[PDB]
Amino acid sequence: KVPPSINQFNHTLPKSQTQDLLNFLKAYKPESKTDKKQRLLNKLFLKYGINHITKLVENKKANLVVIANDVSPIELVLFLPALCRLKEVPYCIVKDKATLGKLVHKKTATAVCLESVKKEDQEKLDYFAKVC
Amino acid sequence: GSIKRFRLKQRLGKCRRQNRPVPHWYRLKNTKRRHWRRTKLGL
Amino acid sequence: GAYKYIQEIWKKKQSDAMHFLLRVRTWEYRQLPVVHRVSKPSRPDKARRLGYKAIQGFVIYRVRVRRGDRKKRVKKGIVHGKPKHQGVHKQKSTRNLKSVAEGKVGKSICGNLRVLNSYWVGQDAVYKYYEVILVDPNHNAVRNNPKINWICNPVHKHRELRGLTSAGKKYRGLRVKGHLSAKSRPSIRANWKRRQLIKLRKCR
Amino acid sequence: ARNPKCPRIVKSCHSKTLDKYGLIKYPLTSEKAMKKIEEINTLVFMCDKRANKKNIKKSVKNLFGIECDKVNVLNTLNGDKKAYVRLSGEHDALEVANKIG
Amino acid sequence: NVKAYELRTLKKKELLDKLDELKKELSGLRISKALGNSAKNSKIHGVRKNVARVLTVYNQKRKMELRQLYKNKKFKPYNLRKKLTKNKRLQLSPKQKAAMTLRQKKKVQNFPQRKYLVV
RNA sequence: GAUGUUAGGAGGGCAAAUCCGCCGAAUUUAAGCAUAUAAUUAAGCGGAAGAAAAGAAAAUAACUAUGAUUCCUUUAGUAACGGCGAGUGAACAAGGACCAGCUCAAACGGUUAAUCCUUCGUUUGGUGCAAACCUUUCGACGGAAUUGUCGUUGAAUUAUUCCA
RNA sequence: ACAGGUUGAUAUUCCUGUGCCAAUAGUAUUAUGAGUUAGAUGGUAACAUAUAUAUAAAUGAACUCCUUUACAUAGGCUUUAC
């Protein structure tokens, strides 16, 4: 027998829906190491990292949150769907942990949040939010 | 015995060598001395 | 923020989700061999809050220790002293079980490292399972950092074997100051020795 | 497999191994040994304890014109090795013995 | 009989050749000793001490040559690194020991302890 | 999680007076002895340093209040414990010696982790006969690091004044 | 692995004779005999057969199945050796 709070991490988005959401996020992948150096040399973005994400959710800086399925200690993500619902932001649990890491140039990542995206795509972000 | 192990044989030789009396010219510039019969090596 | 939530979630315990979870963890541990390295801290909140600092040669070890008394060690079940000491069965060790657990990793097994600290993790009737944080001092990351640096000094080998861990501070009574702990403070032996110490001067 | 990123430790010195001169220390000059040289063309040599027969045979050929048919050895009480080196008919012992002593 | 400084200039082949020659002479002295001869028994000591001297010069020359080859590099063989105590080898570098956190550095820079006098 | 004579490193043992953990008696005392006593001793076993341990208030006081730790002088053979027998037995103040403070974690910083490390290198020095040490900034290429490194120590903002 | 001899003191160990056992790499030559125009024959049978400086050589993998190694005590009988 599995407790509800633990149980809710079983039901991800559908695979096709997941891919579509991931693809939509993809272009807002943060500034990468070589690029950062180039920018510096001359003279928006997806925010990650669990502590930072909790603050972003709390302060309603968050607008859409994507949560990884299967971090090894459940506790470090356990509060997050509940918190997101309470502070009233759309959240989605996505199947693949590694890919969310790839999306931020890391070997793994826990959650990723999108505060705002370009005006031309705002409707699509609203659609993902609606699905969630 | 007839047989020995090499370390033991070498040691028996060492004791034998040790016995040899003080050199006669040296006295012209002993107290400690193995004797076989009544004073066993034991090792 | 994140760590606060996880702290409170672990704080409740006998809440359903945690209780299920502890049982599952305890099951896994009951299978695993007695001392083993773990990938990254099992309880991030407690470990980080305690000694742990993530970058490079800080390593986690999970250790299993047997519960209850230890029994008096006298052979064949009889003690030849006075009746006051004749009791074999109910005798109780001075070190806490947590300290023993830090010892079991701390001595030969992980003996490159130095034990920094240790946190609770989980329990069953047969075993208590503790996680021990240990740190290397022969690798640059600890040598360079001005923070935490001290543990590389030669004078901090084997803290867990000397009562110089949080558990160590505990069973020596060093945790509680004030009049209530009285004689403990400069060391229990040292304090006894000072009180006994009988002093004379040249002219009296 | 193996790939050391630099040598672990380097021996600087000339070799501390037991050399050919020093391996064989000196001919034996006992009455018994003189007799053997005379009668059966066999030369008696004192050597280091840690010598082995093959090394003595090579060494003797290098150090003298001797070629060795068979080499018998024994460890004395005193700590010195005694090697009976039986000469081959390729040369005749007496002259070679006379030349060395 | 010969003295170190005269040896030190010489080429390595010549030095080794000289050593081999002395060894042969030494063997000859021993052969004499084993026989009934007494005459030259005193001379062997001289030869042996000379042999020792030749060996010292060659080994030293090699050591220098090896050190000269292994300049810089951060990765000498263990033997050529410092032979200070185990306790010293384990220990921190002074540079590392000295180093301090930035805020502490700021604090020391702003408020150094100072020299002062009174009425 | 295994596996590797993979690359760099570490631990083992000896030494103990002082020093730190354990574990732990009895002879003895009581004119006997059983609780006590001997003793948080001896033996046993583990671990350090040139000293260690302790240390920066979950302290004491009940005053006109003191103010990290250690030690000395002391309180004190006292409060107290104890077949309330034998015996055992503190603390606070006070006089001194010395006199030193601190940082993680927590909060805060995302128009960009500002961190860290190996290997390759590269230069401003200084010593030294040489060996060699000792300072010195600057880049690569790997990794590590958001399952949390780094900065900050509520937050801006004025005048003043300092330090690199 | 045996006999004889030999030294002031050793010998199945030295000497002389005679053997025996174990190794005996790769490559190329040679010589030794086999089989072939990818593996010999005999013997009714039990079984036998290579006498070449040398009885060398009679296809055989995986996988299997044995056997020798390898065994108590007592009592007599019998054969050979000394």
Short mmCIF file of C-alpha atoms (C1' of nucleotides) in Angstrom, two decimals, chain F:
data_model
loop_
_atom_site.label_atom_id
_atom_site.label_comp_id
_atom_site.label_asym_id
_atom_site.label_seq_id
_atom_site.Cartn_x
_atom_site.Cartn_y
_atom_site.Cartn_z
"C1'" G F 1 26.69 -0.66 -7.50
"C1'" A F 2 30.60 -3.79 -9.30
"C1'" U F 3 35.29 -4.25 -12.03
"C1'" G F 4 40.55 -2.37 -13.13
"C1'" U F 5 49.16 -4.20 -11.49
"C1'" U F 6 44.35 2.19 -14.99
"C1'" A F 7 46.49 8.14 -13.05
"C1'" G F 8 47.69 10.76 -8.59
"C1'" G F 9 47.61 10.18 -3.46
"C1'" A F 10 46.44 8.18 2.07
"C1'" G F 11 46.08 4.65 6.24
"C1'" G F 12 48.83 0.08 8.75
"C1'" G F 13 53.86 -0.40 12.69
"C1'" C F 14 57.26 1.49 16.52
"C1'" A F 15 57.59 5.04 20.65
"C1'" A F 16 54.14 6.89 26.05
"C1'" A F 17 56.35 10.58 30.93
"C1'" U F 18 52.79 14.22 30.37
"C1'" C F 19 47.84 13.70 26.99
"C1'" C F 20 42.87 11.81 24.98
"C1'" G F 21 38.47 7.54 24.42
"C1'" C F 22 36.84 3.08 26.26
"C1'" C F 23 36.82 -1.46 29.31
"C1'" G F 24 37.56 -2.62 34.23
"C1'" A F 25 39.04 -5.55 39.21
"C1'" A F 26 40.63 -7.23 43.79
"C1'" U F 27 43.93 -7.33 47.74
"C1'" U F 28 42.13 -3.42 51.27
"C1'" U F 29 39.24 -0.34 55.06
"C1'" A F 30 35.24 -1.32 58.36
"C1'" A F 31 39.14 -4.48 64.36
"C1'" G F 32 34.01 -9.81 61.08
"C1'" C F 33 31.01 -8.76 56.71
"C1'" A F 34 26.97 -8.49 52.92
"C1'" U F 35 25.70 -1.87 51.54
"C1'" A F 36 29.77 1.26 51.54
"C1'" U F 37 35.16 1.24 51.16
"C1'" A F 38 39.63 0.27 48.23
"C1'" A F 39 38.51 3.22 43.03
"C1'" U F 40 35.28 6.27 38.18
"C1'" U F 41 42.51 3.33 40.80
"C1'" A F 42 45.64 -1.11 38.78
"C1'" A F 43 45.71 -4.39 34.83
"C1'" G F 44 43.30 -4.92 29.48
"C1'" C F 45 42.38 -2.38 24.73
"C1'" G F 46 42.16 1.83 21.21
"C1'" G F 47 44.31 7.34 19.79
"C1'" A F 48 47.23 12.32 19.57
"C1'" A F 49 50.61 16.48 20.29
"C1'" G F 50 55.21 19.66 21.70
"C1'" A F 51 52.05 20.11 24.92
"C1'" A F 52 46.95 17.86 24.49
"C1'" A F 53 41.81 18.71 26.58
"C1'" A F 54 38.63 23.04 26.99
"C1'" G F 55 36.53 27.23 24.91
"C1'" A F 56 33.19 32.05 23.18
"C1'" A F 57 26.99 31.11 27.60
"C1'" A F 58 20.34 26.49 26.79
"C1'" A F 59 26.64 30.36 32.79
"C1'" U F 60 26.23 32.36 37.81
"C1'" A F 61 23.65 35.36 40.54
"C1'" A F 62 19.42 37.50 43.25
"C1'" C F 63 23.83 42.19 43.80
"C1'" U F 64 25.10 48.89 43.25
"C1'" A F 65 25.01 42.57 39.99
"C1'" U F 66 28.78 39.72 37.09
"C1'" G F 67 30.30 37.81 32.05
"C1'" A F 68 34.65 32.39 26.60
"C1'" U F 69 38.12 28.69 28.24
"C1'" U F 70 42.56 26.78 31.47
"C1'" C F 71 45.57 27.31 35.76
"C1'" C F 72 47.14 29.22 40.44
"C1'" U F 73 45.60 31.30 45.45
"C1'" U F 74 40.84 30.13 47.64
"C1'" U F 75 36.01 28.96 49.36
"C1'" A F 76 36.57 23.85 52.37
"C1'" G F 77 37.52 19.37 55.27
"C1'" U F 78 32.48 23.45 54.49
"C1'" A F 79 27.22 22.67 51.80
"C1'" A F 80 26.57 17.64 51.07
"C1'" C F 81 26.79 12.09 50.78
"C1'" G F 82 27.23 7.65 53.96
"C1'" G F 83 25.44 0.22 57.73
"C1'" C F 84 24.34 8.88 58.52
"C1'" G F 85 29.33 3.58 60.49
"C1'" A F 86 33.96 3.36 58.39
"C1'" G F 87 34.80 7.07 55.79
"C1'" U F 88 33.84 10.30 51.53
"C1'" G F 89 32.89 15.35 49.59
"C1'" A F 90 31.65 19.77 45.77
"C1'" A F 91 30.04 24.68 43.68
"C1'" C F 92 29.45 30.34 43.53
"C1'" A F 93 31.78 34.61 44.77
"C1'" A F 94 36.74 36.91 46.08
"C1'" G F 95 42.55 37.62 45.12
"C1'" G F 96 45.57 36.59 40.78
"C1'" A F 97 48.32 34.38 36.21
"C1'" C F 98 46.91 34.92 31.40
"C1'" C F 99 43.58 37.87 28.72
"C1'" A F 100 41.06 36.67 21.85
"C1'" G F 101 37.97 35.92 19.22
"C1'" C F 102 35.03 33.50 15.90
"C1'" U F 103 31.82 30.45 11.05
"C1'" C F 104 28.94 27.05 9.33
"C1'" A F 105 23.85 26.17 9.01
"C1'" A F 106 19.38 29.54 8.70
"C1'" A F 107 17.77 34.57 5.99
"C1'" C F 108 19.10 37.53 1.66
"C1'" G F 109 21.61 37.68 -4.22
"C1'" G F 110 19.09 34.43 -10.94
"C1'" U F 111 19.01 39.87 -17.62
"C1'" U F 112 22.45 34.20 -16.12
"C1'" A F 113 27.36 29.73 -10.18
"C1'" A F 114 29.76 35.24 -9.26
"C1'" U F 115 32.56 28.67 -7.14
"C1'" C F 116 36.24 24.64 -6.79
"C1'" C F 117 39.85 21.06 -8.66
"C1'" U F 118 43.56 17.71 -11.78
"C1'" U F 119 46.52 17.87 -16.10
"C1'" C F 120 48.94 21.18 -19.70
"C1'" G F 121 51.27 25.23 -19.66
"C1'" U F 122 53.01 30.56 -19.36
"C1'" U F 123 55.82 35.10 -16.46
"C1'" U F 124 57.26 39.63 -12.12
"C1'" G F 125 60.65 38.11 -8.96
"C1'" G F 126 64.33 37.05 -5.08
"C1'" U F 127 67.91 34.10 -2.73
"C1'" G F 128 72.27 30.02 -3.69
"C1'" C F 129 78.76 28.23 -5.99
"C1'" A F 130 75.68 24.63 -7.68
"C1'" A F 131 71.76 21.70 -5.91
"C1'" A F 132 67.71 23.88 -4.95
"C1'" C F 133 64.15 26.71 -2.62
"C1'" C F 134 61.17 30.92 -2.40
"C1'" U F 135 57.80 34.70 -4.12
"C1'" U F 136 54.49 35.81 -9.25
"C1'" U F 137 49.68 36.60 -13.30
"C1'" C F 138 48.01 34.51 -16.91
"C1'" G F 139 45.51 31.56 -20.13
"C1'" A F 140 43.95 26.74 -22.09
"C1'" C F 141 41.63 21.64 -22.06
"C1'" G F 142 39.12 18.34 -18.97
"C1'" G F 143 36.11 17.43 -14.98
"C1'" A F 144 33.53 18.53 -10.11
"C1'" A F 145 29.51 21.61 -8.57
"C1'" U F 146 22.06 23.63 -8.52
"C1'" U F 147 20.13 16.46 -4.53
"C1'" G F 148 23.60 23.90 -3.61
"C1'" U F 149 29.40 25.90 -4.60
"C1'" C F 150 30.27 31.07 -3.97
"C1'" G F 151 29.06 36.17 -2.27
"C1'" U F 152 26.31 38.71 1.62
"C1'" U F 153 25.35 38.79 7.36
"C1'" G F 154 18.12 42.55 7.14
"C1'" A F 155 17.53 46.21 2.82
"C1'" A F 156 18.49 50.39 0.19
"C1'" U F 157 20.05 55.62 0.62
"C1'" U F 158 22.63 60.34 2.57
"C1'" A F 159 26.77 63.03 4.22
"C1'" U F 160 31.68 62.27 6.33
"C1'" U F 161 36.01 59.30 6.57
"C1'" C F 162 39.11 55.29 5.47
"C1'" C F 163 41.49 50.84 3.12
"C1'" A F 164 43.30 47.82 -0.73
#
